[model samples]
Target: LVHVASVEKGRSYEDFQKVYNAIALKLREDDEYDNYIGYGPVLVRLAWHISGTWDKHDNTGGSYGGTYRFKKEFNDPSNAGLQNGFKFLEPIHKEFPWISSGDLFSLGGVTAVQEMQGPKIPWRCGRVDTPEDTTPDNGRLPDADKDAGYVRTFFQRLNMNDREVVALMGAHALGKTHLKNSGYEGGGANNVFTNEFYLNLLNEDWKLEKNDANNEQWDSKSGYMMLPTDYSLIQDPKYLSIVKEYANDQDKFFKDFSKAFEKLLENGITFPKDAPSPFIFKTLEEQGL
Candidate 1:
């Protein structure tokens, strides 16, 4: 069992809920990134990458210490594009001023996922701030250029199983891979925020083509793009059936995604079943009433 630092003293549920509201509100304001793709998906990816660093054996790194806000972690090459997410959260951090960075970063992910209509991920509020020295070394996050086997093996470090891996990759369906960000370009365009990634996997005839900038585009008949890793879902027979399943049913994708995403967020932590079920917060726009 990973050694989880107990929740920060004096913080309670209502305090964290106010933090949640702050993040939810800022998400509404930062709506014009990546051709209006919105900050939601990348923020989810940011929180996932930050927490995904945990080893579970020593508990050396994880979201418990929100060190990513520092230059050492933020400047990581693998995290090339994530500074945008941090920048988006800057104002909220100033407004709240008292919440821990760990809590804010993790809640940004929770808010983004739920606001995008993905799932209600339960969150906790004990993550304390760590110094810059605590940031994990670079090259910890998954590489987009790898195959299914590599993706599967890479996630094992973070303790994700095959089903969880497949579901998490489905999140690629939400945002595109920037050429400057990942060297793979034009994978997802328009960011429609749907389960169309699986559909594009099974139905489209993807022809590898160079985009205007000469980076390879995983172009399809539907005018969508898939990264090399995304295409691996179909190339690997073991992963294909699940891809087909999500392709066939959007509801199944949603359900599986919710479970898998929650698992991803909760990685390295042990929660008794009676511990509160995950909270599903409404978007600020929805709370206007």
Candidate 2:
């Protein structure tokens, strides 16, 4: 359960950057999925869902094993829409067959974020492929229809605090929820990542209503909707304070989120002291995309 980071012998930043460039180029070319939102949002969501399974108590389901490639975890109802991301990465995996599933999934998120002009997330690659038996069960992931206390308790299993929780949730700005995907619908745009999620949380004139799916969600005329868990960020006093801060300061939110997302990917995996330092990759802009 407690897997330690292991380098694929003789690999370095350039090797990984080559992999990053392949993913970035695919992100540029694969513009049709999700109506031009591209593969960016789903890739990040894939990374989060893969890593979110980490149980700090037992260190069971972190990004270490890359078990989402296995059928059972992939078939979990909670992972309904992520197949898009997995399919998107399939070609990339074929191209870089030497890279582990854990590295590719987590690196895909970092590449998506940076290429989309979000924060700079420092990444280290060492995760090797895990067997089917190492995969966690179906119900380990968080649910959409939940309250603030549920959100807090769920993340506690991952060892995240209030500020980290708010920061991680700021990723909502990247893509929208589909009615069929998670019983919620509202996310727009690609290539531009912002603190707009926090801003919307604070400013939206949200009304509680049941969607056609008949699940309670907060909807606004701006073609946005928030799940009960997202709305809970504003309803809870402690989470609200952090939400207010992120909504006000985009830079602060980016910095905090970079740390939190990286931590999410690294949860339950121990890195050796001699493990290579985390690599802060150049943006596509810096690389002249």
Candidate 3:
């Protein structure tokens, strides 16, 4: 029942690509973050967090509004530690003031994913800036310290099924959790974009331990950790099947991840049949990275 957001006028592949290149170039230069993987994971997390606020039931709080700029959304307890990615995008926003905040925010995620050798997400631009009052409440985002039922139920609000949920979570392989930020830790290789999360989940002997933050999490000597919700992927038979499948097949993981991520970004917003088809931009590798 939401009106389709109009694509940003007069913008095309080249315009967005230029923005992608800038993000890509900066990612290459900022490799020291998160132990030299750069800001790629956090940027992906930022976009996911921004878009994840959507609730399909009422069609509110999606990336379309770009309301995260408001103090209510920016100061959201769920958004802890995301300011780094926000600040990173600030210069880009200043450079392309013509672009809507929603476009830049989502595009930054697309740019980070591709730059880090993840999937090429097909994107469309057109999220007009709504007023600050439209910002969603802080708790709409998912909580990590829960079980499979919680994971399944939480994503159901976003209209995702088991396969899609598992695939989307493959993204966790790319970034680690900060205890201070989310009270959970990454499963492994926090820098490399791969199916390592599933591999680690299925392979590691995780023990429940309370970190310095005094939160219980599953930890392993591999220097990896998993939130209870992350652990649920394997605990639940339905999700476990998909986790094993992704852990075993890399190409399958990437393909499904790409499709699911596009869905995640587009959820809660309607696109007219006449709206321009989605766009798949060339990666820096395709364009001489």
Model 3 residue 154 CA deviation in Å? 0.7
Per-model TM-score versus the true fold: 0.88, 0.97, 0.96
Per-residue lDDT tens digits of candidate 3, residues 74-134?
8998999889999888888888888888888888888888877787789977778888878
Ranking by TM-score: 2, 3, 1
Q: Which regions in candidate 2 have their CA more than 4 angstroms from the true location?
A: none
lDDT of 2 by residue, 118-222 (tens): 999999899988899999998988998989999999999999999999999988878878878777756555347889988888888999998877899998888
Error of 3 at 36 (Å): 2.1
Best by TM-score: 2
Clashes of each: 2, 1, 0
lDDT scores of the candidates, listed in order: 0.75, 0.90, 0.84
Candidate 1 residue lDDT tens string, 4-95: 54555665676677777877766666678787888887888898888877775676677877879877788888888999989888888898
RMSD of each: 2.6, 1.1, 1.5
